[PDB]
What we know:
The structure is cut from a larger assembly and holds 2 copies of chain A, 1 copy of chain B (99 residues), 1 copy of chain C (100 residues), 1 copy of chain D (98 residues) and 1 copy of chain F (175 residues).
Chain A: H1 6-14
Chain D: E1 2-3, E2 26-27, H1 29-37, H2 42-50, H3 55-66, H4 78-88, E3 92-94
Chain F: E1 3-9, H1 14-27, E2 34-38, E3 63-68, H2 72-80, E4 84-87, H3 101-113, E5 129-131, E6 139-141, E7 143-147, E8 152-157, E9 164-168
Antiparallel strand pairs in F: 1-3, 1-4, 2-3, 5-6, 7-8, 8-9
The complex binds zinc ion.
Chain E binds a DNA duplex (27 and 23 nucleotides) through residues 27, 31-32, 105-106, 116, 195-197, 240, 244, 246, 255-256, 259-260, 263, 301-305, 337, 409-414, 450, 452.
Amino acid sequence: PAGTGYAYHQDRMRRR
Amino acid sequence: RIRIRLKAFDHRLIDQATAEIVETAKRTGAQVRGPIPLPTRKERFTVLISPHVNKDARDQYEIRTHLRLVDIVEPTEKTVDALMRLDLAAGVDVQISLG
Amino acid sequence: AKQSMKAREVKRVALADKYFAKRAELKAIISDVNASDEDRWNAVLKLQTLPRDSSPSRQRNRCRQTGRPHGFLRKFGLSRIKVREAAMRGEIPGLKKASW
Amino acid sequence: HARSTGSYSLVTQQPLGGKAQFGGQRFGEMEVWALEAYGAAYTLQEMLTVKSDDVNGRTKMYKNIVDGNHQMEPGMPESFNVLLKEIRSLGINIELED
Amino acid sequence: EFDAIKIALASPDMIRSWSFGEVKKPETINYRTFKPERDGLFCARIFGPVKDYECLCGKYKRLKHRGVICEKCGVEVTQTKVRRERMGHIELASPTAHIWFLKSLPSRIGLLLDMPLRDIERVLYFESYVVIEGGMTNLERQQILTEEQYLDALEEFGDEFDAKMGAEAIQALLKSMDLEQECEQLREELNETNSETKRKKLTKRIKLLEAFVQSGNKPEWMILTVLPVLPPDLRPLVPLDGGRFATSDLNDLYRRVINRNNRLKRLLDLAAPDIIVRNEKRMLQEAVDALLDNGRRGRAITGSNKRPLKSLADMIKGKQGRFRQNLLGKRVDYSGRSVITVGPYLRLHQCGLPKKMALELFKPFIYGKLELRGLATTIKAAKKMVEREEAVVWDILDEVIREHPVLLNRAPTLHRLGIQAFEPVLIEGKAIQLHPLVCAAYNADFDGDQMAVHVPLTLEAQLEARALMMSTNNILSPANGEPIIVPS
Amino acid sequence: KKRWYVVQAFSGFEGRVATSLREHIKLHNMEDLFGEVMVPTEEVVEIRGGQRRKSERKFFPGYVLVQMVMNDASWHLVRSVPRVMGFIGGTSDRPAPISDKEVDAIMNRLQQVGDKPRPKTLFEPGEMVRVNDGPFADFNGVVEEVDYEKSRLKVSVSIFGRATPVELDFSQVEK
DNA sequence: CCCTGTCTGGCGTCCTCTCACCTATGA
DNA sequence: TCATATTATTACGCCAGACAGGG
Ligand SMILES: [Zn+2]
């Protein structure tokens, strides 16, 4: 949840 | 001594079974007694074949239960246990009895 | 036979299954010559109290397929007619037409 | 030494170590830190799930590479399931919620 | 797929729900043949069949009835990796308290039952008695009792009096410990005192007392009643080159716990006297405590020769546990390693990479390229082609290299400039040619150094190697503003 | 009066510990301070039929019973006997004797569980019998019919992919 | 009762390569 | 071969953390 995966974790944290 | 009572309706099948059992015995142990044929049970049945009435009209069926007495005189370690593996033909009720 | 008859038979069987231990015991008591008279009497009365369908001499052997009371055979559990059919079809093992 | 796909170890489904055993180079801990230090996230995900540990993930990967579709189905490291069995074999009850 | 990982205590119902069969016999394997033991540690019915979709003994040698269990085999019928997830449970005859909750500093059972560690161990190793709701006598609940203290009490309070010992007694104490009641008391005790030391001693006890009530963790779950066994696949029994089995240490630990538990069940069958079953339960307690965390008790047990054998907690902790050795750092396919050399003709986004390493690291891309053209048909044909190395696979190799970066890595990577991505240029040779300016980033001279190459497989990883980790992108050191591609 | 005590030896060298203990007694001639030395046996007899000799550790599995008195000299004597760890008791200062009734009950139970098992061996239709005494040995099977009056068990151990219902004895099989 | 020696546990660098050596007992 | 089950060396260097002792 830092690099390229920060967009993925934004998406997963938004979709809860 | 292990007495073995083979019972079946088909005689050929029974014979086949007996031979197999003998084979199983003879490789492992020694001095198999032998396949002794006991008397066959011919259980007969009469029935009226008409749905309603005609008494002289009849069918007479029977079931021929064959017996084969195989005996094993010396039960070794290897022999008795072997029985579990060697699978025989279906519709043959066997009945082993040590002593 | 009817469905109803079959049902009745089943019920009877069930009853028999249920009450066997007690009934048998009662019978034994009644028989036992080395026993009290009063006790025997009680046993006899006790038996009466129990349901009739509990008796095994109540249930009739019917065909397992059709429920036909007559023409029954024990070995097959079937009435003659059905037995014959089975034989013809090959459905009874070992059974074939006999001649001698 | 070089390795595309060789044998795999038994207790933790990761490649073997060394040269005589046809093995792969240890992508150690400080290299994991050095890829966290960039923003390389998919490179590290395939560097410790697809290329290394997950057995269904790497067979899906091998079919996808020989068919031209560069894509990974991630899954879970099997050695993390080994961690669950070793912690769970104590009196400790570790799980995975939701 | 899943959010947070939850950790809690393991109830005996929870351990029976994990399990698939009670591991009774300690007998590992047959050892003269190849078959295991029915039913020992490495069972059939409790876990699964060694062979995939096969009854190990004899039935189901095709794919029709997956599941049937005959009486001749006492075997399940599933996959070869099914035993790796399945775990067994050992019905410990005598209760044994966990070593992780008895000696953690501070002990979990030490600041919960308000009893000193020294006194806790005494009773736990059958060397001291403990009272539990005596009755109308002159004795406390936490106060312990010795042989002389019990003997006199035995003749005194022969009636309503309870004074057990070991984990059993401890368990009862924990079991009969009203958590909620203690909270208020502790809270009231903290508000009715001024003692600095006491305040800190009371706040540390009430913190672990209210935290236990907040969760679903019971006080009687500290003592182990249904010991769980790790999956065989995770405690592997492989033979080395020869005719003997190099057995793991956990099999020694589990086999001793099961040997002792069988002895203790037989002695409780036979009604042995008190001192025999106290030594027997004490040896079981020490065996369980040695299985879980070996050596936390007095001098650790050993098999061969004087070196102690490695337990479960030593499979977790340390430099060589699972975290630091298999989960944070892993061994990695599509990777290579060789000695570096200079090659100053390079541009600083590219490095030299040998043809032999290039044909080994890029075997699946070459297979995919060969299958696309139509030169071959099945995969086997392609593996024979690159095993023979014909004249046409080098053009395939120059067409899989072209725009595909690789991660070069010098072995002591200290900062992020020690993993950089290049484009390969193929080398007649066996040495990685590395552009010289980049050497001042790696701290790489050329006195015998070695570097590892890693291949970004997927497409997002090729783009991360080109857009974040490319060597043209690292021209300033991240520690400051100074350029790291300074001419050396 | 000499009371009993329990000694722990290296389990497996127990008869040699007992012999060395008797010999240390007759060396240091404290003959009035030792009565006996017991190692408890069940006398298992099955070395012939089924090579196993009734695999059962003759309880106790590593403990030596000594009729003794307690002086510190005799305590040092028993712990100076080789391959002896120490006594088993409440403490190491004054180690613990057993009792009277305990020892009595122990001996009685040994004999009972000894001689020949016969104490409620009603296998019944369940569990899994393991025949080992007689020809058909090293085999498992269930007992459909049980005959306590005839002291026989109608077990149908699976044989050649079937089931052979035979009548065996309680000592011929194993629960 | 607040300082206090004293004792007990818990750390101690990454990556790689070569070689040899592996429980006793026992009627 | 197939169950039986654990003893006669010392020689790191801090550095926290808990514990009985005493003015
Ligand atoms: Zn099977």
